[PDB]
Every structure is written in C-alpha cells, then in structure tokens.
Amino acid sequence: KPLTLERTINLYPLTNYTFGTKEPLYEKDSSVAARFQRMREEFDKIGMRRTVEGVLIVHEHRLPHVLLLQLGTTFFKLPGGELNPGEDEVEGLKRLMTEILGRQDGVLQDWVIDDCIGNWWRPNFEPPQYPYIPAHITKPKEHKKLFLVQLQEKALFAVPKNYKLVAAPLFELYDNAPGYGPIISSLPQLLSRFNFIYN
Amino acid sequence: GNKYIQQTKPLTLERTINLYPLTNYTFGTKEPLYEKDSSVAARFQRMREEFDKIGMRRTVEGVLIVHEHRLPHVLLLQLGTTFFKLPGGELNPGEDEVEGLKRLMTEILGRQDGVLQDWVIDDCIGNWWRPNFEPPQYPYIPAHITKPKEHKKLFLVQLQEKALFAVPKNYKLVAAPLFELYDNAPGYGPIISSLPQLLSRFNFIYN
RNA sequence: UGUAAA
C-alpha cells in the first residue's frame, strides 16, 4: 500500500520523554490588538503571513495525546510560529521547534516532519480562520500550515518557563472548540487517517 | 540524458489533486436503491445480529469533489429531506476496502452505459468508530472500547476530467460547498461537516 | 481557547 493510502506512525509513551525548562520566550505580541496591528504592518510590507505549527503526539495507555503549550490557564497553542520571508516551510518549522522546545545541552534535536495534516486561512485582520480560502478572498492575511512531527523514541525537551506543556487526549479536544478553538479541536479528525503504532 | 522533472515534495507532504467544473460531468437517473433497513429500530437490530455472526461492521465511503468557479464542492446523496450520506456502504467480510468501495461506488452512482467506469482511489482521509449499537461515531477509538461495533473509512475519490453518473431515483444528488459544510455543521453530522478540515491538506488544481 | 500568573 502507498503511504498515500495508508500512513503508519510510531507513538511512544509520554514517559519516554523528559521535559526540562529554559528561560522564558515571550510572544512578539503582548495583546490581541497588538497582534493584529503587527499583522497589518507586516502585510503591507511583506504580504501574507505564513505560519507553521507542529503536532507532536505521544500515547498513554494506547491513547494518542497531542502536546500543547499552555499559556496561563485558558489558552493553548501548538508549537510553531512565523516563517521568515522566503523561508522554506519545513525548514522553518524545525527552526521554530528548536527555539521553543529544543534541549539546551548542545545535543541538537532531530525533527522528522514528512506529513502535512492541514491548512487554515485568515481572510481578514481578525480572529476567524477557515480550513479553506473562503469565496472571493484573493488576499488572505495569514496562511497557517499544520504538520505531523514524528518524535524519536526518546527525547529531551526544554520548555521556556512562561509555558506549560500538556498532553491532551483526543477525546478532550474533540467537539471542544469553546475550550481549544476550531483548529486544535479538529485535530482528532485530522489525525484519524493515521495508522498509529503504540510503541 | 534529459531529466524529466516530477513533483519534488513527497506525497505525504504535498498531495496534489485535480478538480474539474461540475459542468464537466453528466448526471442521469437510474433504478432506485432502497436501504436494507426500514427504520432506526430495524437498523440497530440488524446491526446487533450481524455483529454476532459477521463481527465488526466495516463501512467505506467516498468523497467526490468537483469545483464551481474555483470553490470545491463535495457530492452528497440526499434521502428525502432529512438525510445526507456519502456514496459508499458495507464491505463483505474479508473484502478489500478499496475494491469494496469501488463496488459500492459503481452500485450507487455507476453509469448504466456499457462504458468502463473506473474509480481512482489512492487516499485515505479519515477513520470513524462506533463504540455502541447507537448512532454516535468518533474519529478515534474511545477509551475502554475494545470491541467497536463499526469502523468507517473515508477515501478521496479522484474524478476524471469528464464522467457520467446515474443516481438512484430515490436519491437526490447535491454538490455542497465546503463553506456550507463548515458554516452549517449541525446539518450534516460530524463526519460530513468535518470534510473541509480533512480536505484542507490537499493542493487542489482547478482543472 | 487569550494576557489574572501569562
């Protein structure tokens, strides 16, 4: 069978991974309004924002869990961020993953990113995003591309102090846009096609 | 010699798919295809009996996509006013999923022409599991469910540039824009309404 | 899912 028809992915116990911390790494925007202001500034000058995010998966008791960065108590995001202009998507994601999650011991982590799982577009300088370019939207302000990041068997991660890292089970995310937004809450669907091996 | 350049990105990273105007396709009518069950009560009754003699039900469904003015539409079957379903149905025990789907596709939409109807089915887009003898299905196997009652598999069916389809007289055919499925999720159920999310990874060529 | 710990 083609990898196109069946895609097999190895998951490892959450306990295969040890998590340390590093110095805080704050977002470039300090508020929602600031975020859209900078989105506006840069659109004018570089064009559509290109964002990439990684979906790292571990299992617990043969159950897939997605790793999420928690900010405060009520906000969660996938590890990722903004591509520099002209930057390659996967190369850019590896860069961003190391920045946010890379161990500190000089041992450089090797990210395996071979799978695109989805795409979301932001038509305006506003919160709504859609898994398709909406009708007659010729100039989307942001394009967000999600990848499956296959974790090695064991790894060491370093979480900037300002974040917590959590492993959310799929049932927690499914049907829970009010808690995770439409992008994170539909990862269970986006991941369903994959043939997961537990270990 | 000459190097014939193919797509650089792996197929796992970039899946390119040709879509064609809905106007490229011819639609006709054929003999009605009645559902094997007469009522919800009958449905889960027959499902219970079969689980005992055949094991877990295995369903396959196909997602056929066309475009109108460069917006993707999924082809849906509508029964009466109240029910949308993807073309597909039940595998026989042991039947290959993809061969089964082609069988079912041909049966529900196949042209009664005498012309070869060939389906291109190279992509799995998702899996849904029914943990009890009840309607609810999940895009994952829930905790503590070792014996799901049904496994449903979704496939992307690539259409040729032109094709003829015959629709069973008792069904209507609908091309549903992705924004409809997404903006009005309640109307299509959890499987069809999350098709825009499941299709988003594809690089659709418009023609 | 948003800045109250962030």
CATH of residue B56's domain is: 3.90.79.10
Q: Does A186 touch chain B (CB under 8 A)?
A: yes
Would you call A178 exposed, middle or buried from its count of C-beta atoms within 10 A (0-12, 13-18, 19+)? exposed
Disruptive mutation site among B200, B202, B204, B206 for chain A (greatest number of A CBs within 10 Å) = B200
Residues of chain A contacting residue B13, judged by C-beta atoms under 8 Å apart: 90, 114-116
Residue A2 lies in a domain: no
Method: X-ray
Residue B193 lies in a domain: yes
| A22 close to A104: Cβ distance less than 8 angstroms | yes
| B109 close to B61: Cβ distance less than 8 angstroms | no
Which nucleotide is closest to A178, CA to C1'?
A: C1
Residue B7 lies in a domain: no
Nearest by CB to A189, from B124, B126, B177: name it. B126
Q: CB-hemisphere CA count at 13 Å for A9?
A: 25
Closest residue, chain A, to B121 (C-alpha): A5
Q: Where are the beta strands (DSSP E) in A39-181?
A: 49-59, 64-71, 75-77, 80-82, 112-122, 142-150, 155-160, 164-169
- Find the Å distance, CA of residue A141 to C1' of nucleotide C5: 32
How many structural domains are present in chain A? 1
Residue A31 lies in a domain: yes
Give the structural domain span for A181: 7-199
CB atoms within 10 A of CB B58: 18
Residue B167 lies in a domain: yes
Closest residue, chain B, to A89 (C-alpha): B13
Closest Cα of chain A to B147: distance in Å?
A: 15
Q: Does A43 touch chain B (CB under 8 A)?
A: no
Buried/exposed B194-205: b ≥16 CB within 10 Å, e otherwise: bbbbbbbbbebe
The amino acid that residue B100 corresponds to is G
Return d(Cα B137, Cα B139) in angstroms, integer. Answer: 7
| B71 close to A135: Cβ distance less than 8 angstroms | yes
